[PDB]
Paper text:
CD163 is an archetypal scavenger receptor and mediates detoxification of free haemoglobin. CD163 contains an ectodomain consisting of nine scavenger receptor cysteine-rich (SRCR) domains linked to a C-terminal transmembrane helix13. The CD163 ectodomain adopts an architecture consisting of a ‘base’, formed from SRCR domains 5–9, linked to a four-domain ‘arm’ (SRCR1-4), of which two or three domains were ordered.
In both cases, we observed a single SP domain of Hp bound to an Hb αβ-dimer, and this was coordinated by either two or three CD163 ectodomains. In both the dimer and trimer, multimer formation is mediated by the base, predominantly due to interactions between SRCR7 of one subunit and SRCR9 of its neighbour. The dimer adopts a similar global architecture, with the arm of chain A of CD163 (CD163A) making the same contacts with HpHb as in the trimer, but with the second arm making different interactions. While each arm adopts a very similar conformation, flexibility in their relative positions occurs due to rocking motion within the base. This allows the arms to emerge from the base at different angles and to make different contacts with the asymmetric HpHb head. Flexibility of the CD163 base, therefore, allows its arms to mould to the ligand, likely allowing a scavenger receptor to create different binding sites for differently structured ligands. PISA analysis shows that the arm-arm interactions have a total interface area of ~590 Å2, while the dimeric and trimeric receptors have total contact areas with HpHb of ~930 and ~1445 Å2, suggesting that HpHb will effectively compete with these arm-arm interactions and explaining why we do not see these auto-inhibited CD163 conformations in the presence of ligand.
Author numbering:
A (entry chain G): 36 to 44
B (entry chain F): 47 to 97, 107 to 347
C (entry chain E): 3 to 144
D (entry chain A): 152 to 689, 821 to 1030
E (entry chain B): 264 to 685, 718 to 926
F (entry chain D): 2 to 142
Write the structure that this text describes.
Amino acid sequence: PPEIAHGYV
Amino acid sequence: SVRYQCKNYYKLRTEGDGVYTLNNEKQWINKAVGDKLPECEAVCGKPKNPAHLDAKGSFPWQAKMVSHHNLTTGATLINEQWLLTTAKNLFLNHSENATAKDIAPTLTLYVGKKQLVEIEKVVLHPNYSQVDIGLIKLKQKVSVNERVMPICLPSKDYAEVGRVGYVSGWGRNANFKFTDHLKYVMLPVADQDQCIRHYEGSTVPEKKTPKSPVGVQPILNEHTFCAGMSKYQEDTCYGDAGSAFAVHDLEEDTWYATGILSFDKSCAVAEYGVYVKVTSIQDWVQKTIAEN
Amino acid sequence: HLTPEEKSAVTALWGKVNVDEVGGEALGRLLVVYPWTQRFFESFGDLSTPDAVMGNPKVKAHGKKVLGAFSDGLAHLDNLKGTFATLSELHCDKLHVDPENFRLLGNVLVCVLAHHFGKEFTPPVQAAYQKVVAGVANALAH
Amino acid sequence: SDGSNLEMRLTRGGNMCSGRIEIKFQGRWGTVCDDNFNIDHASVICRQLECGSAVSFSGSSNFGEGSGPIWFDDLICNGNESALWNCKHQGWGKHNCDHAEDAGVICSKGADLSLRLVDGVTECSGRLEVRFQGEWGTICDDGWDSYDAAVACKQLGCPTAVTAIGRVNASKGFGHIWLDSVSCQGHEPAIWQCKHHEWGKHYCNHNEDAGVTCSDGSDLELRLRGGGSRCAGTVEVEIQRLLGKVCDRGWGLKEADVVCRQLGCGSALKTSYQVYSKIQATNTWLFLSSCNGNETSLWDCKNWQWGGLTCDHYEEAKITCSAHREPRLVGGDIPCSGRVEVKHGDTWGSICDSDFSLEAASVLCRELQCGTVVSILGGAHFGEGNGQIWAEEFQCEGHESHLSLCPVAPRPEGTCSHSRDVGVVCSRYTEIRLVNGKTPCEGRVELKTLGAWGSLCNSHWDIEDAHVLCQQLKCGVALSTPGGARFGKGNGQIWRHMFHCTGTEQHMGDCPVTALGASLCPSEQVASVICSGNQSQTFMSLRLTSEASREACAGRLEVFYNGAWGTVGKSSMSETTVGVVCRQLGCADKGKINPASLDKAMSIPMWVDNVQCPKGPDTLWQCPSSPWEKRLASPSEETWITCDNKIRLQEGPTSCSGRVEIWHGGSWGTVCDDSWDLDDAQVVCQQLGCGPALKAFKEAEFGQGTGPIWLNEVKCKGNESSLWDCPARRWGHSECGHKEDAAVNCTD
Amino acid sequence: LSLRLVDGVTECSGRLEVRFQGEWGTICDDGWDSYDAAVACKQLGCPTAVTAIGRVNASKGFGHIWLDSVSCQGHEPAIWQCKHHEWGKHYCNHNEDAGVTCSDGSDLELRLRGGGSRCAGTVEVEIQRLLGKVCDRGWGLKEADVVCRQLGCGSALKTSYQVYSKIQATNTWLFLSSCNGNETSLWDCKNWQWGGLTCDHYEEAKITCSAHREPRLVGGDIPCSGRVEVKHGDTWGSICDSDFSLEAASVLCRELQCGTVVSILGGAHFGEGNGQIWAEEFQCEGHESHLSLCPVAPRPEGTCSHSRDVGVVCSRYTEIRLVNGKTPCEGRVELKTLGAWGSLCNSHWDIEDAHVLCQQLKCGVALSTPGGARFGKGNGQIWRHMFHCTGTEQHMGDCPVTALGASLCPSEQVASVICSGNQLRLVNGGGRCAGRVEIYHEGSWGTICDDSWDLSDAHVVCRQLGCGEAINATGSAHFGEGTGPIWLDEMKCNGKESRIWQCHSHGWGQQNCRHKEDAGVICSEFMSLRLTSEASREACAGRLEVFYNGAWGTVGKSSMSETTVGVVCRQLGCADKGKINPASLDKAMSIPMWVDNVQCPKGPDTLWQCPSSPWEKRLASPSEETWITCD
Amino acid sequence: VLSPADKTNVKAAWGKVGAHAGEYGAEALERMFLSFPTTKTYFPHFDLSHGSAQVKGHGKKVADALTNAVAHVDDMPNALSALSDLHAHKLRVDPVNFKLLSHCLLVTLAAHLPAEFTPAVHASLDKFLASVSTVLTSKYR
Ligand code: HEM
Ligand SMILES: *[C@@H]1O[C@H](CO)[C@@H](O[C@@H]2O[C@H](CO)[C@@H](O)[C@H](O)[C@H]2NC(C)=O)[C@H](O)[C@H]1NC(C)=O
Ligand SMILES: [Ca+2]
Ligand SMILES: [Ca+2]
Ligand SMILES: [Ca+2]
Ligand SMILES: [Ca+2]
Ligand SMILES: [Ca+2]
Ligand SMILES: [Ca+2]
Ligand SMILES: [Ca+2]
Ligand SMILES: [Ca+2]
Ligand SMILES: [Ca+2]
């Protein structure tokens, strides 16, 4: 999955 | 499936849902917003460890700015990339004809534990002779953590008479020396009539005179409010200008910037200090952030 | 550092001090002149007027303790940092006293010494005691 | 509304007849602004509340800020209405005022005002206290001056002649300080009718309480206490019956002059005295403020204070005045000389000749504007001083400006009386005038010597001498020196004194003067001058002769003139000419005149004849005589003399015994007894022509009185011709004490 | 958790390291105390005898720092059980890491180097084969005494050096905090850090103990006299007379507590030495407390011959002891002259001499002086030394004393003192019983004016001084011009007064005189000397005459020793020895014979002490006249 | 802030100071120069040796200014207008130095006037000197 700014999966 | 979550001191602001299920097309599709990811914004006003008192706690929004002749002043961190300060702070060591482009490359700005941050541009108020306020834009977003955190703007007016607010400052102490460690003090809001009479003589536009006990007149008008000394006769002094008048809203457990200190020359010799209402400048602030 | 002449002057004048009087007077003057210092001594009772402060027995006891600690440092003028480690730890860990308050108390102590010893407190001994109190304040800083 | 339902009130005052003005209207309490507020509004207000006779009005929330609406602003009232709402105004509730400008009023029915004086010497001296709303309080001295004291004294009803400030003898008060910065002009009927600071806000303390002292003027006295006269000492004040001192906060000669003028002692010289006595202690002080200097008394100085302050680290004021030891010259037959009498206050007395030196003579001649000492003639002379004889050892040092400053060392015993008083002469004894002119600043020059007037010659008369002359006669700078008999020909004696004035000297007597043999002049040749008349505008030698001996003080007299010597007339030589000659050649005070002898060896022509000296000069060049005439002369015309021997003894039981005296420099003296040996006593009595010595004494033998010690440590070998050849040290300087003068006893 | 010592000089010394979470880290030195060192040592397998703190020879720290302000009471065995605030949450830095230095006790040795001997010079530590220096961070006499005490040297006089130079230098230091001063060795002084800091703007510690140069006197029969030997820490030698000066001697007698110098002597007068010879220039300023304190010049290459020894005699050479009393503070007073004991005559002995003799033996103040044979006459001779103590000195030998032909003492008058057991001088006169007279008042010295000065007045002063009757009363500043104040103007005593302050006078400060009129007195007990001939009024070759009682007289030839003529010449200031010789029969004045048999002992500097037969005036033949010539 | 009681105490104390004002000011300047050497940077042309007449004159000037301020305690900013402009703009004296000099002044007066320095008067004098300092440094920028 793609990353988002300042966020985790 | 994956569920997106924002790390400590952040929060998802987009609508829909942060859960994304993998497709047979091998696309990541949230059944609400589809292909669009969320973004993580920063908590504004929730200090980790809340509360002339030494600051070893949580005033993360406080910034320290030093002019090119070694004079220290203050600034307030409004969001991850903008700071709010006093116009007179930016006009240190040059004629008031100087443009905003001549001010930005001459300032040093610290946050947290002496962490240096770079400045990109400065935006003074269009009417800074009456609303003495200015904005600082950082080159890149600051990383929110235990030591750095914004104090986002209020929705309602907390400048009620009697309200006690907290003021952090990097300015001069009782020995007129710039403080080595950050300090804070709890100050109540005073009524306008007494402050105006104390500094200008009368509330009538005519037959006003300069009566300031310190020899310098504050900018008193409809965009300002006054705060008196503390229970133990503690007051702000030189260098505290640009700091915020923070109010703790107990119903929401959030800290709100109700005012920015403008007149920091009382130093316990004058009774009241003058702060610029944030609610009266919120539209200009939002317009400048959005326009850049 | 203090020159041998300065150390001689400091230790010569310090012999005529009433250790059970000067400390209480200095602490009371600190509490009166700088009201916020009363915040740390809320257990001492009435502190709201100069007469109440100067007549307080707990104030005199604690001034005695403070001047005893000060005199102990006067015998270790080259190793102030280590002499005052425990007091520094106390004042930072439990009370959170700003380091400038130490300098205020030192200056008040200098004023009290001048008041008691009159014209004998010539400018050179004042400068020596300024160095001493600055050292003590820096040692207690953190 | 006709005004019936309205009601007025005074709040936050000391009582119901004082405080902030408040009015109810439409159910709300409200105030009145202080714009255009004056005593007329107050009088109108203190009429409808039954409190009478408005005393004062206030502004700027003197009684605390009010609340509610403001009803009135910029009202004009005429001082006599039924109520405040009858005045003309712009409109109800219309204003540009705020609650920092509320009005207030004090009416008389409440403030039962009164005044009193307490804790002082008399019924109306002491500390002032004002009663306000039943409580007694004091007045701060800030702004308190003589005009306020005058108003207070007149209010209390006691003499307004002299009204000074200061709480004499009174202690700090207790309670309120009601008044401050009182600004009375001096004619108001009460102290509170003047302008003063608001009753509330004063930063004064009770060490500053005010007071007054009212008097008729007959109870204020001034004296100098401690010292040898009424004209020197610590200045002490007796006001009422209280004794006190003056404080030197601003003490200087300018006000010392006023004090001395008051006491009648002349002019102030020094700010100290000689402590001839002890003065008692006192706790009250007088404080002065910059007297202008031309006041006739110390009481007329502006704002002098009698008590109410301290003189910590300061001391008492003290002065010595000109009349402390003022001198006088009496008995002298010619100006600027004669016997001396000194004044100690207001009593004139003589001083023994045993206590007066040449420094004293110089200061004396300077003080009396007579010049510098020319002669001291110790011993009964110029008559006798029949009166009181002061016994004060004068120790004058340097050249003090006035005789009063000279240190003096009194004694407790009596001394010489009517045999050894002393005289003095100075260099200001010239008798000259202008005559035969239309104005006193032009005319012929005449000069008196002996007992005759005559016409002065112009042989050496010059513009400098003319300027000095007109400076003497109060005629300013000279203009020119006309020649010939421009103001008449000579009709009498023709004096020929050629003066040599430098022109910078105030009186012609102080110039060098030459008269002996001066050139003959005809009657048609006289000196004359003309001057502006505005005061504002600004070698020779005398010798004596004898065979195989020269420069000795016995033989024929001669004068060197124009490159040659010559003889002077024997005819008519008087005793005073002999005295002058001997004092000039220095071998004596005087001598005798005797016929010629065989010792002459030089047939030298005669230069002058008929020598006669006047009183006053100390050399022979200032002695009138016939003019120069180089005629041949016979021995009967030649002049021969023999001075008196300089060494004489005194106090001895007989001749050939007694202390050893010596004459030099004009006045007699003694010798010191260190090294006093039989060789010197062998020279002493042989010099008298008596015989060999037999004993010499030490340790106070034969008197310890008068004179300077012209010699000491006489290392005389015993075969000397004279006592002045000995190598005695430091001629004239007193290294020895006075208890150790010389003494000799030797065989007849 | 674990402990580790790394990169120190030995396995039991170095930086202290602790392992936590699998990563090693160092402790912050703040608050590190000797108790912490003891705890860290007891947790490890190293000796627990001595535990000093600090980084010995360790390099700068690196990595992580785990703990700060570790505080151990010493009651538990492991370091991490002690008190600390939190792990890693501290503001320390790697330049301030702690350490320890375990030791077993028999390795700490201290030695001073760079100076005259082991007891002077810089302090040089050598511990675990690493040798460094002490720093002046808290160095003074209080700590100095310990080092001198530890080395066997005495009290520490100063921090300096004289003689040798060129010491080595090392970058490791010993730091003391403060140690009260009574410790037997430096190591016992609390919290002595070894290494870690290079102290800048503080210099190295230096010492000069009393044992650096110590004087001694041996070869003499009178207590305070003989040749001078000096000890160089542990060795000895002789002192030449060429390089010894009076300023050094005054100190030599000062530290010996023998009073002050009364004579300095050269040559092997006290005996030739039998050892090594010292050569050292003494350069004392005069008021120094010890010889070592005085500066010192380096040794020269030359040496003196053994016939060049030096010697001194000080003021305190009178042996006085009390006997026949229950306590030693009450018995009769005894004395020695010429190799024989004796008992003192009380004929001229007041309470003042009793005060002094009681203070000598720590008997406190005097109480009374019994009369008669109150403690036994004694078997020894009765001594005739008239004592004239001023009552302030603390020994008999200090006082003025004279016995030359004193009157015969009656048998039963032996002096004694009962102890508690707890201002007139004649100046410029020469001798003690003559000259201008002065009195001490307003705490200042002043003279008496000459007016009314007559022979009756002069009686009182010399009864007050004990000098017998007056023979002259002089004025016109016979004995010089006095300086300072003039106090007494005129004196009208009755002639019978005991003290001058009881006479009729105008009172202190009242006067009418000048300095050229100062008064004086000459009294019967003034003595003087002379050697004269037919062709010289004063010399030192001819007949010997003595002044006494206002008149001159010749000295006796019978019983004349060799020491007498030496004393005579020394008093006349020509020679230290003399020879008798025949002379002519031409009597100059044919004066009387004053005293018969003179015999000067060893030690005195004049002839007025040497005892002999009491005075009696008689005629004598020229054969009985003493004729002396001084070389 | 200065209360009426503080103003009374200041007036009493400064009245007792009296004519010794110049001596006290010169002594205070000497104390400051001896204890805080950094203050000497603003007097480069001054002979700062012991008893220098220049230092005495400057001390008397300071004492006269303080007496003028005590007279006009209610309108200090106007009384010290020129001195405020001088120190803030022409000399650019840093505000730390003013507290140093105020402490030196208090030390001097306490040394010389033991009886007058009751703790209340001490606090009032601190307030007065703090007000003077704040007025003189307010325009500093
Ligand atoms: C209570 C605080 C002070 C007062 C009332 C005061 C008063 C004065 C006065 C009366 C003058 C004379 C101005 C003139 O003559 O025109 C002056 C000048 C001056 N002041 Fe201050 N002063 C104060 C504190 C200080 C301090 C703390 C400093 C520096 C550390 C300072 C530095 C100077 C200098 C350098 C001058 C110029 C002197 C000259 O040019 O001769 N002042 N001040
Ligand atoms: C005082 O001293 C003087 C000398 O200093 C003595 O005077 C001499 O005394 C002798 C004694 O025989 C006489 O021969 C001399 O003639 C005296 N000299 C003079 C100048 O007269 C005097 O004797 C001493 N006083 C006493 C009491 O002996
Ligand atoms: Ca108005
Ligand atoms: Ca109006
Ligand atoms: Ca006054
Ligand atoms: Ca007036
Ligand atoms: Ca004489
Ligand atoms: Ca002679
Ligand atoms: Ca005499
Ligand atoms: Ca006599
Ligand atoms: Ca006399």
